[PDB]
Write a structure and sequence with these properties.
Elements lengths: L8 E10 L2 E8 L3 E8 L6 H12 L9 E5 L6 E5 L4 E2 H5 L8 H20 L12 E3 L5 E3 L22 H6 L4 H16 L11 H10 L11 H9 L11 H14 L2
Family: Belongs to the protein kinase superfamily. Tyr protein kinase family. TEC subfamily.
Subcellular location: Cytoplasm; Cell membrane; Nucleus; Membrane raft
Protein name: Tyrosine-protein kinase BTK
Length: 260
């Protein structure tokens, strides 16, 4: 299967602490550069996680973080992925030294929209889409990661992911691809806001109340009326009125072509 021999891994440097444990940079078989995420003990429903992991291993798309294998015959569990040099997109946006161009911001939205259109086509829900869960490689390409892992988190008022959730999730936990749509719109807002906190002046519970009342994030300065109309369309009250990732990608492609 997708089992990797942990004895063929080398830990050269700890890149930081992510969701479900620490992440290392090392070599696989002394040939390939990889990132090894060590699942912290007691942070996930490991049995359910290992099975579904095999399903996620078969998901293949350029804009999804490439999964190489796992190390489940031991503890802590190891996840071997490709090394994204520029790390977390959120910290990447909050790096003013990069001086992102508007065209680059739209390119980052398209990268994420490609992966979500693929996940949508396979009927796989991410359920925690946000800049913090996206990664960037040396070439500046954004890729989606941690898709579908919140299902196996072990919880140990309103929590932080409320700021990326539509009303039906806040009130009923009715997760669907349409709730990924909403979250993607907030992701576009983070991008064009260069990592700004959504609803920065509000607590989690207050954000939930304002969302249920119809409050929407404002138009970022770096976003044109055309771009803001796309991210704003992810925020229709009725889940069935929100466009699919097919339409979102189609819209983003149209704007990019006009800017060509
Ligand atoms: N690959 C990287 N390359 C460079 N850095 C990386 C990573 C990662 C990483 C590694 C693996 C995974 C994973 O398991 N995804 C997955 C698995 C499955 C498996 C069930 C089948 C299913 C879906 N997604 C997710 C993130 N994390 N990190 C830094 C961590 C610390 C914070 N970071 C920062 O940048 C801030 C310091 C600035 C990023």
């Amino acid at each position: 299967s997708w089992e990797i021999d942990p004895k063929d891994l080398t830990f050269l440097k700890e890149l930081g602490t992510g969701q479900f444990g620490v992440v290392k940079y090392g070599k696989w078989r002394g040939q390939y550069d990889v990132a090894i995420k060590m699942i912290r003990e007691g942070s996930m429903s490991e049995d359910e996680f290992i099975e579904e992991a095999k399903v996620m291993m078969n998901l293949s798309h350029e804009k999804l973080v490439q999964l190489y294998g796992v190390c489940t015959k031991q503890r802590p569990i190891f996840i071997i992925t490709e090394y994204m040099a520029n790390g977390c997109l959120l910290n990447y946006l909050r790096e003013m030294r990069h001086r992102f161009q508007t065209q680059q911001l739209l390119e980052m939205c398209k990268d994420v929209c490609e992966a979500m259109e693929y996940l949508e086509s396979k009927q796989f829900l991410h359920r925690d889409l946000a800049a913090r869960n996206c990664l960037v490689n040396d070439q500046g390409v954004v890729k989606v990661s941690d898709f579908g892992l919140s299902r196996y988190v072990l919880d140990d008022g309103s929590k932080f992911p409320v700021r990326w959730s539509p009303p039906e999730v806040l009130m009923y936990s009715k997760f669907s691809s349409k709730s990924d749509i909403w979250a993607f719109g907030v992701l576009m807002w983070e991008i064009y806001s260069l990592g700004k906190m959504p609803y920065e002046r509000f607590t989690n519970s207050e954000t939930a109340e304002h969302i249920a009342q119809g409050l929407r994030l404002p138009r970022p300065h770096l976003a044109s009326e055309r771009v803001y109309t796309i991210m704003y369309s992810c925020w229709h009250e009725k889940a069935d009125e929100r466009p699919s990732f097919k339409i979102l990608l189609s819209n983003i492609l149209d704007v990019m072509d006009e800017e060509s």
